[model samples]
Target: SFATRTSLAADLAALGLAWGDAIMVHAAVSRVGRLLDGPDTIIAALRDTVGPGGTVLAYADWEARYEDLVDDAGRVPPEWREHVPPFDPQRSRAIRDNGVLPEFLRTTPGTLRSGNPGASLVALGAKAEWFTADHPLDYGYGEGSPLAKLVEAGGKVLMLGAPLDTLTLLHHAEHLADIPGKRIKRIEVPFATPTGTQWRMIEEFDTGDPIVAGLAEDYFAGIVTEFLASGQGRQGLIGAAPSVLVDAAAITAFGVTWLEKRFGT
Candidate 1:
């Protein structure tokens, strides 16, 4: 048995997705089961549910090769940097680890991606330009990032068969959480410009490592688990996959409170 766009759209509406809404999606297409038209069916269903006035967003980060250039000591090897090419937002492919949907969204006509190479986001529909514009090179997940904009826009976070650990919006909460000793990392990425390749140093909270100490492994998942236990957010099945939809602001607020309570001071 396979899911079609019509059935998927109906399921999404039943799961609380609405017309004219803005949403950030984390999807695991494989978990959704066989699709009549592959990942396209999912996207089509999402668009159908949201309608013309709605917006869809996904993280479309690129392979920055951070480990290849910088070592644990934060030293950059000149030799290792020689082969790294400038990240062209228009041409560079999305990181494969994020699943196939983001890459598909990245290549979708009318989709706009943010400027940050390491933490780019692709968006489509009414707020596409508004979401991707002026993405800060530093703290790509912080105040001025698309993640922040998403929260401010009254958006929803949709977990489409994706694990709670894939909650990217929580990184924005990490940036806002008043926890002590949050780790920061700096890396240089070459950005393609009209004239030449410009290498710029950007700094952000080290999203690779745990944001705080003495927490469970994959604290993001733990946070979501607690959130679910508290009976927040709407949950249902999209295809054979268990899915969840929560207000982006709600989850970020919850995450901030959770982090501050556990790791603050």
Candidate 2:
């Protein structure tokens, strides 16, 4: 039998979610087995579990490539530049790599999305505006970003049948890690304005690659695994899929320590 909204919410509550809690969710709907109404059921369940006072967040980056805009010599191609659409938070589809839930959430009525195309987050509930407002174009994952706000709000990270590698909150940890040899990149993104499409330069860590060199390819997974092993989070099955609920601050602190210890401050 497929899992209904009520059943999924019950499972989530059983797994430690509570009313008035804010959560950053990384989900793989397919891994959760059958659902009565597909992804909507999961979203509904989450909303039900958290209630009106709580909030749900999802990473909703838009799809674009640095190579597509820049030529072999690293100059913007006039033709390519003119053709590329400016990122419109409400209209642009979420990058498919993060799966379907983010796009769904982004389209959900009353959901607010951050401004940075490369690191935008979609949020719903009491803190939606606070979580997404004034997202810094530069260092979008760093101190002033939504991820940082999530940590500060005493939120939780819920891995809903998603792989440990999808824990993007760790990127905030990477930024906070006072370590040597952190990789950085400055990229230009086109933004839509009343005047026209304007390209803006935004600096950020190389989230596409390992933040620090020589780390395992699955280092994010490794970090989450180590955190789970340390017993700081609750783990259980949501539907047929394994899920985890960990305090955002706790895991981020652990991640910072993990990165610093290995990479050196």
Best by TM-score: 2
Query: Model 2 compared with the native: what TM-score?
Result: 0.96
Model 2 C-alpha lDDT per residue in residues 114-156, reported as the tens digit of each score:
9988899999999999998999999999989999999999999
Stretches of candidate 2 off by over 4 Å are 69-75
Residues 40-59, candidate 1, lDDT per residue (tens digit)?
A: 88888989999988999999
Model 1: lDDT to the true structure: 0.89
In candidate 1, where is summed lDDT lowest over 10 consecutive residues? 66-75
All models: lDDT? Answer: 0.89, 0.89
**Model 2 scores what on Cα lDDT?**
0.89
